[PDB]
Design a protein around this nucleic acid. Structure first.
Ligand SMILES: [K+]
Ligand SMILES: [K+]
Ligand SMILES: [K+]
Ligand SMILES: [K+]
Ligand SMILES: [K+]
Ligand SMILES: [K+]
Ligand SMILES: [K+]
Ligand SMILES: [K+]
Ligand SMILES: [K+]
Ligand SMILES: [K+]
Ligand SMILES: [K+]
Ligand SMILES: [K+]
Ligand SMILES: [K+]
Ligand SMILES: [K+]
Ligand SMILES: [K+]
Ligand SMILES: [K+]
Ligand SMILES: [K+]
Ligand SMILES: [K+]
Ligand SMILES: [K+]
Ligand SMILES: [K+]
Ligand SMILES: [K+]
Ligand SMILES: [K+]
Ligand SMILES: [K+]
Ligand SMILES: [K+]
Ligand SMILES: [K+]
Ligand SMILES: [K+]
Ligand SMILES: [K+]
Ligand SMILES: [K+]
Ligand SMILES: [K+]
Ligand SMILES: [K+]
Ligand SMILES: [K+]
Ligand SMILES: [K+]
Ligand SMILES: [K+]
Ligand SMILES: [K+]
Ligand SMILES: [Mg+2]
Ligand SMILES: [Mg+2]
Ligand SMILES: [Mg+2]
Ligand SMILES: [Mg+2]
Ligand SMILES: [Mg+2]
Ligand SMILES: [Mg+2]
Ligand SMILES: [Mg+2]
Ligand SMILES: [Mg+2]
Ligand SMILES: [Mg+2]
Ligand SMILES: [Mg+2]
Ligand SMILES: [Mg+2]
Ligand SMILES: [Mg+2]
Ligand SMILES: [Mg+2]
Ligand SMILES: [Mg+2]
Ligand SMILES: [Mg+2]
Ligand SMILES: [Mg+2]
Ligand SMILES: [Mg+2]
Ligand SMILES: [Mg+2]
Ligand SMILES: [Mg+2]
Ligand SMILES: [Mg+2]
Ligand SMILES: [Mg+2]
Ligand SMILES: [Mg+2]
Ligand SMILES: [Mg+2]
Ligand SMILES: [Mg+2]
Ligand SMILES: [Mg+2]
Ligand SMILES: [Mg+2]
Ligand SMILES: [Mg+2]
Ligand SMILES: [Mg+2]
Ligand SMILES: [Mg+2]
Ligand SMILES: [Mg+2]
Ligand SMILES: [Mg+2]
Ligand SMILES: [Mg+2]
Ligand SMILES: [Mg+2]
Ligand SMILES: [Mg+2]
Ligand SMILES: [Mg+2]
Ligand SMILES: [Mg+2]
Ligand SMILES: [Mg+2]
Ligand SMILES: [Mg+2]
Ligand SMILES: [Mg+2]
Ligand SMILES: [Mg+2]
Ligand SMILES: [Mg+2]
Ligand SMILES: [Mg+2]
Ligand SMILES: [Mg+2]
Ligand SMILES: [Mg+2]
Ligand SMILES: [Mg+2]
Ligand SMILES: [Mg+2]
Ligand SMILES: [Mg+2]
Ligand SMILES: [Mg+2]
Ligand SMILES: [Mg+2]
Ligand SMILES: [Mg+2]
Ligand SMILES: [Mg+2]
Ligand SMILES: [Mg+2]
Ligand SMILES: [Mg+2]
Ligand SMILES: [Mg+2]
Ligand SMILES: [Mg+2]
Ligand SMILES: [Mg+2]
Ligand SMILES: [Mg+2]
Ligand SMILES: [Mg+2]
Ligand SMILES: [Mg+2]
Ligand SMILES: [Mg+2]
Ligand SMILES: [Mg+2]
Ligand SMILES: [Mg+2]
Ligand SMILES: [Mg+2]
Ligand SMILES: [Mg+2]
Ligand SMILES: [Mg+2]
Ligand SMILES: [Mg+2]
Ligand SMILES: [Mg+2]
Ligand SMILES: [Mg+2]
Ligand SMILES: [Mg+2]
Ligand SMILES: [Mg+2]
Ligand SMILES: [Mg+2]
Ligand SMILES: [Mg+2]
Ligand SMILES: [Mg+2]
Ligand SMILES: [Mg+2]
Ligand SMILES: [Mg+2]
Ligand SMILES: [Mg+2]
Ligand SMILES: [Mg+2]
Ligand SMILES: [Mg+2]
Ligand SMILES: [Mg+2]
Ligand SMILES: [Mg+2]
Ligand SMILES: [Mg+2]
Ligand SMILES: [Mg+2]
Ligand SMILES: [Mg+2]
Ligand SMILES: [Mg+2]
Ligand SMILES: [Mg+2]
Ligand SMILES: [Mg+2]
Ligand SMILES: [Mg+2]
Ligand SMILES: [Mg+2]
Ligand SMILES: [Mg+2]
Ligand SMILES: [Mg+2]
Ligand SMILES: [Mg+2]
Ligand SMILES: [Mg+2]
Ligand SMILES: [Mg+2]
Ligand SMILES: [Mg+2]
Ligand SMILES: [Mg+2]
Ligand SMILES: [Mg+2]
Lengths: 254, 132
RNA sequence: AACGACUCUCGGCAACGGAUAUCUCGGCUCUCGCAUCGAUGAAGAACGUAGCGAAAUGCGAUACUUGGUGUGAAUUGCAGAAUCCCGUGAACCAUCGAGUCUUUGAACGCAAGUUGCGCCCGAAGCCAUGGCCGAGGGCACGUCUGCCUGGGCGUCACG
RNA sequence: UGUCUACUAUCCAGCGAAACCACAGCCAAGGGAACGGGCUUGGCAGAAUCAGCGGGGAAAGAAGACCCUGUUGAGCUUGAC
RNA sequence: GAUGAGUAGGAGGGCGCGGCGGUCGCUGCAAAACCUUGGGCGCGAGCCUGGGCGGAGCGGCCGUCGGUGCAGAUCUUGGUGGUAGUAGCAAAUAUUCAAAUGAGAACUUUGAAGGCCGAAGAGGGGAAAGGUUCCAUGUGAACGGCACUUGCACAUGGGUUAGUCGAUCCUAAGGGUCGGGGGAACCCCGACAGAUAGCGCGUCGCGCGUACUCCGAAAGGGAAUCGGGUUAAAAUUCCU
RNA sequence: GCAAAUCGUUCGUCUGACUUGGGUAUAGGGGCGAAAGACUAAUCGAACCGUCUAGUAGCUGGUUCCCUCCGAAGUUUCCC
RNA sequence: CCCGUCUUGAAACACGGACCAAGGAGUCUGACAUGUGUGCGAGUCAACGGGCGAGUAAACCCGUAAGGCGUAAGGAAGCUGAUUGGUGGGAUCCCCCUGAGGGGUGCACCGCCGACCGACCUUGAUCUUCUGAGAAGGGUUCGAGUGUGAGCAUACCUGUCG
RNA sequence: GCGACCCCAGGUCAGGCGGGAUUACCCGCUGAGUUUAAGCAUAUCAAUAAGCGGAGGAAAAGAAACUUACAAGGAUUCCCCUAGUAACGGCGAGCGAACCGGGAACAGCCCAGCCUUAGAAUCGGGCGGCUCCGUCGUCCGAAUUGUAGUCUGGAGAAGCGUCCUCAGCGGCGGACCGGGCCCAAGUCCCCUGGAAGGGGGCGCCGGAGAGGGUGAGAGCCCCGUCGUGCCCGGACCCUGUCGCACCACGAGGCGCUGUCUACGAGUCGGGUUGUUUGGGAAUGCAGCCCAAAUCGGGCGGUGAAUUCCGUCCAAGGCUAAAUACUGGCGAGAGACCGAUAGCGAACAAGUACCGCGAGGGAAAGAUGAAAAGGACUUUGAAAAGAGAGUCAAAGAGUGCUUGAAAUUGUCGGGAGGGAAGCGGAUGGGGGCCGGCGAUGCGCCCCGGUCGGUGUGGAACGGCGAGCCGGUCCGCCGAUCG
């Protein structure tokens, strides 16, 4: 999503400066000709010179973008989705889910019909997701450093991610004004929102319709996806990650 | 969040548009809230301050002071209020400029245009806010 | 070999200087939309123009503006204004369709280190058809269509 | 060689630069990049300051113009291509 | 249990700077930066903290990114020393006395004296070039390489009057051009390849008619002004 | 330094191939030269200005934090 | 003994450095290569473009005889195109035995020697459309070949080159 | 001599057209060298820079004298691929396209020539009228050395019959582009402060928590922002609908028909020279020489003759879209710079200033929330000082936020016989440090305070229906801790 930046191609070279050569008790750097102005006789063209040209000037044809293989991107998304169902990971990422009834958090499809922001907030309170949303609002603050003058004035913590499965659902606009709350359609889940900062354990609120579509969209270990042609969920190198069971099993301990 | 493509969220552009605004634009930017009594009467929240209006200062060191507007110094983004003054080192009296957003309009200088403006402001609120 | 001066050195304060930090109506880069200069005198250059201005910005002897329309009470550094307020109405306001637009410049009567040197038309005014006076305008080059006036035994026809 | 005059230098009031500067500034020998202000061994060595002086600082002025090197030139010449 | 040198060079683990995605915090009950003979931690890059100053922002941690770390380059820009109150003020003969003015006088003004330029001048004008430096009044600073009450400085105002003086007109070396000839074109030649410009006399007509009615001289050529008077500053220009 | 060529004294010529103002002509591999490679705006054995251009350099100079570990070569062959 | 520097050799009578602040030099990009991380695997790659979508430069989806690289090589070319392993060491495991032991197992890798495909050479029963087919049989020749695939995408360091 | 025509001349004749400017992209011409090749001359740099011209919102190109050799594609342009490939190259350094295939877009056409001859059926200008980007009438011209119709190879002309198709304007609306206006919610209580926009408390809006302003971090103070509603204007194109009109004479389509069936010249092509290209016995272009054809001509990537085959039809012209865009005008955005940075220029910057000239070309941003910009007293010729005053602050006093280093003065401590600094080790004198250094613990009784086995409830748990538990409340007993 980056926009290119680069200095002007002609910066530092809008001058007819030439070296004085040796024999005049000064360095051999090129110098502005003429007289009658402080600029006359000053150094030019050098990356070490005031008003000169920077070393290796930045160019717009820097390789800004990256194309990661599609199968790796799908692998990353599946891992993020799986991490969101582990309360330890969700807590570890900074989400306040102490009052959440259960993870994964699946709510009735009637939430998709909410039209007013006031009713949207009441829905969050009922399911226990409001405290995480309240954390985001209370973290609203001005960005430290030069970013604040670069049209990036405000920062805040991430709130819950709401996933819905109905196109054109009205909840997209009832929740959007709430700071920290993101809305995404199930068919087009985005990794940058599933693992913000590259950190697993996003707090996700699933609608019933969206939750039921996960098998069709991502398939299973046995049959492939219906919408990702020829895609199957990846396998781990370790079927059972519980070392204690393996190490303390009768077979090993014998 | 804004969605109009003709509207900019750039801080640089917003500040430039504010400080280079012409006098007619500065009139709208120099608006003050109506008092709770006038708000319930005309069903209007804000109005551009006028020369002969009466206002009450609700912020600053002159909080609570009441008086009549005497000069809308648009070039300086302030208004002058009768008797709201300080003394110079030489004893002379100079009016203190106050931002119109920091006062409340207690009485309006009504006229043919002012009354018509009040109707338009109330017409939208009476429909877009209540009937909806 | 005290004291004091001098030199060096450490600390407090005071100087010298403008680094650092925090700023930004600027710059840079990317993307998008649009197609609109001029002999109907352009771009550029010059001179002038405000109650108090030199520059910048604006404007053209109607000269930091006229007119229309919108907005609806200022402009402001000072002065002044029975200029202006339930309004044919303030504004160093916005906008544009009416109107003005000096000398130049492709620059066009000829020239130019010259406000130099010509010719033509002519309202108004005025003295007895004429005379003076005169606002304003005209007179470059190449070229197209048409037209008028002509030249050559160029090719003919008739006296 | 001496001497005479003027203007400087000299002293004062006022005014007031620059070149140059690693750090610095007493010597002998020794060793050392074979010619030291610094190192080794000795001589010695006493605040601050004035006018002069040209021994030394291998003094300053300038990336040696002489000479050589470069697969750098340029002016000129001719039986070079 | 053994073991420890290291230029050129390689590699590892770490420190520090500025953003971005996240996360955890601090701040007008005082952030950043900066200052300190305060204290402590790390072999070290550095880090933590007391006090002061300052008056509005800032930091830790994970990931990720970069115009990311200086003693040097006769490095760049800016600032500042020693040198040093030092070198130095010296050509063109020269000043002195009294008084006035002023806070202040070797330097301003008046008077007196003594000298110099000595008519191919240190005098009186003008052409170029400058452009208000001209004149009056006033003046804090700066400037006039000491000084100034001073002024070619600064501020405010004032000042250049033509039928006869010039430009203007004429042509010189030459310049710029029509047509024609060249030229991709910018341009080249320049009356040389051509139905010249028009003029004169009658009152529209007759006669004449050799391709530039152009630019080119404030010293060449050339219609006409003389005394007397007048301003703080103009005059063969104003007045008679 | 008064001065990026001046000052003092001393010297050459001085009715001519004399001196000088203004106007005008010749422009960069070109001009102009009683000829010194002189002169052509403090620039001349090829002016000045901008651009190509951040020209190329086997050559000179510099090349920015910390500890820890390993740790050289000046020898072979070929090469205007 | 003064730092920095070139040097066989610097405290040098070798050069730079009066002093302070700030600025100040292996970077970006294309190609390729080894190494490592990750995904998938005889495949791999959403790359031009399309469908869309945070009302959206992102993310998500699409390869239907697309294309790139790989999946087969040799030959200048006309052309032809892999008969599918033996052996000496060897990891691990199994059995006996409790030896520097003896059997079975024999991956990776290395050495050695055949076979197969192709260039070149050689060979020809038996057929054929007269120039081809191929029973058998070859070679101190040659190859960036075969003998049950290992590649493709992507990230970054280092190196060569523009 | 009078006339017509031809050619030419003059005109301040009537009415028109042209020049110049701009640079990002576009079209034509002209045209280097640095450089690379480790030298260098071909080559390369480069069909590039500089130079000279010409356009537009795009330009240019464009309806095959094509690709290809296949089961064939089918104007042009552009992207991916082809491909760093074929080829070219002191075959060195290097250089380098195209077709197929996949996509974006998509659009086709107009003339010249034989063909009115019972009628120049065409066009311009003057004048006049009308429903005025035009149309009608009239007059004078242009034109037969040919205007208009018909035709363009995909065809077509002519004849025949099938009996298919073809004739306008206006009203309203939509779509499209531009603008204008109204419209959510606290400025409630306490504390700090110069100021609340900060903290704490209590509320509210949200399809609006983009952004900015206001005396400190403001969703609710102000402008805006989200979403409707209303209003005005521009385009005359596209499109929906309605009303009126609606003559097939002619023309076209389809079918057949013996016949006819006209197509661009100093051009193609060839030789030669130069240049250019990947184009190699020669890719294009250009000069000169030669110079065509009509059952023919061009092409088919090795020159030539012979026999076939495929393919297209040059030497005339127009044409939207996909594509380009460091200029102009308007708009949005950014992991960019933050006053030695970023454009040279954040500011009266292409300005001051320099150069005869072509040209060269800087430095320079920040008082405070508000000037509230320091009255007055006193000293001095004045600048100014001292005191006082404004302010939260003059330790913010008109180049004033913060105010580092070099360097300087002053006060205080200390040292010094031709450097000083520096490493290591102590000492003297300073300065600094109470987490610089503790004061508890165990066992007794005096008092005070607070809770205590077995049965009841409340909400749960460990192990896997059932066992095994703790916590809290209450009631008894126990009588200690
Ligand atoms: K001292
Ligand atoms: K001190
Ligand atoms: K700063
Ligand atoms: K004009
Ligand atoms: K002006
Ligand atoms: K107006
Ligand atoms: K003249
Ligand atoms: K003195
Ligand atoms: K010695
Ligand atoms: K030379
Ligand atoms: K952070
Ligand atoms: K400290
Ligand atoms: K970081
Ligand atoms: K003069
Ligand atoms: K005259
Ligand atoms: K004259
Ligand atoms: K004469
Ligand atoms: K007279
Ligand atoms: K003489
Ligand atoms: K030259
Ligand atoms: K070498
Ligand atoms: K060196
Ligand atoms: K050396
Ligand atoms: K040295
Ligand atoms: K494939
Ligand atoms: K596809
Ligand atoms: K072969
Ligand atoms: K007509
Ligand atoms: K705000
Ligand atoms: K034809
Ligand atoms: K050729
Ligand atoms: K043929
Ligand atoms: K600059
Ligand atoms: K301050
Ligand atoms: Mg020197
Ligand atoms: Mg710069
Ligand atoms: Mg910072
Ligand atoms: Mg203006
Ligand atoms: Mg003219
Ligand atoms: Mg004139
Ligand atoms: Mg000695
Ligand atoms: Mg020495
Ligand atoms: Mg000694
Ligand atoms: Mg001594
Ligand atoms: Mg000496
Ligand atoms: Mg001497
Ligand atoms: Mg030296
Ligand atoms: Mg040298
Ligand atoms: Mg030299
Ligand atoms: Mg060389
Ligand atoms: Mg050599
Ligand atoms: Mg040479
Ligand atoms: Mg070691
Ligand atoms: Mg940081
Ligand atoms: Mg210190
Ligand atoms: Mg840190
Ligand atoms: Mg950066
Ligand atoms: Mg850097
Ligand atoms: Mg430094
Ligand atoms: Mg160094
Ligand atoms: Mg230096
Ligand atoms: Mg300097
Ligand atoms: Mg100095
Ligand atoms: Mg002296
Ligand atoms: Mg002297
Ligand atoms: Mg003297
Ligand atoms: Mg003298
Ligand atoms: Mg004197
Ligand atoms: Mg004399
Ligand atoms: Mg005399
Ligand atoms: Mg004389
Ligand atoms: Mg003086
Ligand atoms: Mg005077
Ligand atoms: Mg003056
Ligand atoms: Mg005269
Ligand atoms: Mg002449
Ligand atoms: Mg000429
Ligand atoms: Mg001509
Ligand atoms: Mg002639
Ligand atoms: Mg004349
Ligand atoms: Mg003349
Ligand atoms: Mg004369
Ligand atoms: Mg006079
Ligand atoms: Mg002198
Ligand atoms: Mg010539
Ligand atoms: Mg001579
Ligand atoms: Mg010679
Ligand atoms: Mg130059
Ligand atoms: Mg050789
Ligand atoms: Mg040596
Ligand atoms: Mg050394
Ligand atoms: Mg020596
Ligand atoms: Mg050297
Ligand atoms: Mg030096
Ligand atoms: Mg630095
Ligand atoms: Mg790899
Ligand atoms: Mg394929
Ligand atoms: Mg073969
Ligand atoms: Mg074989
Ligand atoms: Mg006319
Ligand atoms: Mg070379
Ligand atoms: Mg070389
Ligand atoms: Mg060479
Ligand atoms: Mg060019
Ligand atoms: Mg043009
Ligand atoms: Mg245009
Ligand atoms: Mg287009
Ligand atoms: Mg076109
Ligand atoms: Mg055709
Ligand atoms: Mg095609
Ligand atoms: Mg390939
Ligand atoms: Mg090429
Ligand atoms: Mg294609
Ligand atoms: Mg015809
Ligand atoms: Mg027909
Ligand atoms: Mg037909
Ligand atoms: Mg509001
Ligand atoms: Mg609150
Ligand atoms: Mg503040
Ligand atoms: Mg809206
Ligand atoms: Mg044809
Ligand atoms: Mg030819
Ligand atoms: Mg050419
Ligand atoms: Mg065309
Ligand atoms: Mg554009
Ligand atoms: Mg700058
Ligand atoms: Mg900075
Ligand atoms: Mg502040
Ligand atoms: Mg300050
Ligand atoms: Mg200091």
């Amino acid at each position: 999503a980056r926009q290119p930046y680069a200095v002007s191609r002609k910066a530092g070279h809008q001058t007819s400066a030439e070296s004085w050569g040796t024999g005049r008790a000064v360095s051999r750097i090129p110098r502005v000709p003429g007289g009658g102005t402080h600029r006359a006789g000053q150094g030019a063209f050098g990356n070490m010179c005031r008003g000169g040209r920077m070393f290796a000037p930045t160019q717009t044809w820097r390789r800004w973008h990256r194309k990661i293989p599609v199968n790796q991107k799908r692998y990353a998304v599946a891992s993020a989705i799986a991490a969101s169902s582990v309360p330890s990971l969700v807590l570890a990422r900074g989400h306040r889910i102490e009052s959440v009834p259960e993870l994964p958090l699946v709510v009735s499809d009637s939430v998709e019909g909410i039209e007013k922001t006031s009713n949207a907030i009441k829905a969050l309170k009922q399911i226990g997701a409001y405290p995480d949303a309240e954390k985001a609002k209370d973290s609203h603050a001005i960005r430290p450093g030069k970013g604040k003058m670069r049209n990036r004035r405000y920062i805040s913590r991430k709130g819950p991610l709401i996933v819905y499965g109905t196109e054109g659902a009205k909840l997209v606009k009832a929740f959007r004004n709430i700071p920290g709350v993101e809305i995404c359609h199930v068919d087009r889940l985005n990794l940058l929102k599933l693992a913000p900062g590259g950190h697993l354990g996003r707090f996700i609120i699933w609608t019933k319709c969206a939750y039921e579509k996960l098998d069709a969209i991502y398939g299973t270990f046995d049959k492939p996806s219906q919408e990702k042609k020829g895609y199957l969920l990846p396998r781990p190198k370790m079927v059972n990650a519980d070392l204690a069971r393996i190490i303390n099993s009768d077979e090993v301990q014998s | 969040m804004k969605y109009n493509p003709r509207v900019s969220s750039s801080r640089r552009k917003s500040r430039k548009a504010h400080f280079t605004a012409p006098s007619s634009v500065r009139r709208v930017l120099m608006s003050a809230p109506l008092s709770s009594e006038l708000r319930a009467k005309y069903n209007v929240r804000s109005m551009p301050v006028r020369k002969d209006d009466e206002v009450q200062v609700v912020r600053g060191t002159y909080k609570g002071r009441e008086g009549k507007v005497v000069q809308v110094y648009r070039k300086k983004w302030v208004i002058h209020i009768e008797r709201i003054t300080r003394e110079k080192v030489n004893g002379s009296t100079v009016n203190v400029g106050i931002n119109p957003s920091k006062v409340v309009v207690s009485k309006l200088r009504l006229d043919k245009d002012r009354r018509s403006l009040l109707d338009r402001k109330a017409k939208g609120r009476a429909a877009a806010d209540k009937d909806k």
